[PDB]
From a paper:
Orthologous proteins to ependymin called ependymin-related proteins (EPDRs) have been found to exist in various tissues from sea urchins to humans, yet their functional role remains to be revealed. All of the EPDR1s fold into a dimer using a monomeric subunit that is mostly made up of two stacking antiparallel β-sheets with a curvature on one side, resulting in the formation of a deep hydrophobic pocket. All six of the cysteine residues in the monomeric subunit participate in the formation of three intramolecular disulfide bonds. The EPDR1 fold is very similar to the folds of bacterial VioE and LolA/LolB, which also use a similar hydrophobic pocket for their respective functions as a hydrophobic substrate-binding enzyme and a lipoprotein carrier, respectively.
The frog EPDR1 structure was determined first by direct phasing using single-wavelength anomalous diffraction (SAD) from a xenon-derivatized crystal, and the structure was subsequently used as a search model to determine the mouse and human EPDR1 structures by molecular replacement. Only one molecule of frog EPDR1 was found in the asymmetric unit of the crystal of frog EPDR1. All other contacts bury a BSA of less than 500 Å2, with no conservation in other crystal forms. In the frog EPDR1 crystal with only one monomeric subunit in the asymmetric unit, the same dimeric interface was formed between the crystallographic symmetry mates [BSA of ∼2300 Å2 per subunit; Supplementary Fig. S4(c)]. Also, the β8–β9 and β10–β11 loops in frog EPDR1 diverge significantly in comparison to those from human and mouse. In particular, the displacement of the β10–β11 loop towards β1 in frog EPDR1 confers an altered conformation of the shortened β10 and β11. Lastly, α2 at the C-terminus of the human and mouse EPDR1s extends into a loop in frog EPDR1. Although we do not have direct evidence, we have modeled this metal as a Ca2+ ion, which is likely to originate from the 0.2 M calcium acetate condition that was only present in the crystallization reservoir used to obtain the frog EPDR1 crystal. The Ca2+ ion is octahedrally coordinated by four water molecules, the side-chain O atom of Asp121 and the main-chain O atom of Pro122. The four water molecules coordinated to the Ca2+ ion are further stabilized and arranged in place by hydrogen-bonding interactions with the nearby residues Asp124, Glu175 and Tyr177 [Fig. 3(c)].
Residue numbers in the entry:
A (entry chain A), B (entry chain A): 30 to 218
Write the structure that this text describes.
């Protein structure tokens, strides 16, 4: 039997990638499926909601968050109606904060196809419940899952997949021409 | 470019295994870490809660659910005080119901260590929100994650890992001697 040190700090998540996610929102119970272009160097993130067959939702959005310019564009994918809004909130990366609490390492999957991952949190002894848990791969530190009990009880779980390093198509961060735009509230049905 | 049929039915999850889980309960915000012995053939499941350093919780339980006998034993791991209770609810396997809606297939992880998985749900067009989403491996159909918006807004996400087929230690389903026991309500702090 052998004794593995707990890691002194967490691995460093990739800075740029193209991937896909599911965002599960318990306040609404909604699962949102999106293609994501993520760039922590410029602190921008582009989210393209996906439509599946016969979902009861008519409206689907593209989001372009440009934190270095304190603006977010939201575009109805059909109408192409744009909303330009101010971003007050600071950038938040998909990574493990360097002061996170190490929780575990384990294998996801079966024999012959299993992947080692690590789990980290913001657990400390002064607080009964964590607000953040992250599951990242051991080998490349890619995000796998995060749950965020953030926002005073407004919680989400995000699952990450089909991630590919780098950004093959930068143009996605250019807002469309219809984005000579004002600050409308666009929400889904 | 190529066109993959959607699967006509889902893969068949393993019937017996030993593994570990994290159960994230939004009603409380709690993350419970447990070692699990799972047996769908006898419809029994043994859950052993894990204690981590300096969690503010004093009480940790072992559960032995024996659905074929409509009884569940709950044991305080320290005191060894047992509770024997009646099970009214039918067995529910960790599997994909054969009438589930196929949602997606994708790779978790990075280049050189990534695992293909499938996602299934209980989505139908008559209901805005799913009550159940399951993520299972393609290769062996091992559970990876489930979220359950079951119970009229009482929702959980479960993550599965370190799964090994078969049950190396059957004795765990034998209740301990202190289980000449009554029906106490034992809850955590
Ligand atoms: Ca973050
Ligand atoms: Ca089930």
């Amino acid at each position: 039997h052998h004794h593995h040190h707990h890691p002194v700090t967490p691995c460093e998540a990739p800075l740029q990638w193209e991937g896909r996610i599911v965002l599960y929102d318990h306040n609404t119970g909604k699962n949102t499926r999106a293609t994501v272009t993520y760039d922590a160097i410029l602190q921008r993130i582009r989210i393209l909601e996906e439509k599946k067959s016969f979902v009861p939702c008519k409206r689907f959005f593209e989001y372009i968050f440009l934190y270095q310019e304190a603006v977010m564009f939201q575009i109805e994918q059909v109408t192409k109606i744009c909303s330009k809004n101010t971003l007050t909130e600071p950038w938040d990366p998909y990574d493990i904060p360097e002061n996170s609490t190490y929780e575990d390492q384990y294998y996801i999957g079966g024999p012959g196809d299993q992947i080692p991952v690590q789990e980290w949190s913001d657990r400390k002894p002064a607080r009964k419940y964590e607000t953040w848990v992250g599951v990242y791969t051991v080998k490349d530190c890619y995000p796998v899952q995060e749950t965020y009990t953030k926002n005073d009880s407004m919680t989400t779980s995000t699952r990450f997949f089909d991630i590919k390093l780098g950004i093959s198509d930068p143009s996605v961060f250019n807002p469309p021409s219809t984005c000579e735009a004002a600050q409308p509230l666009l929400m889904s049905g």
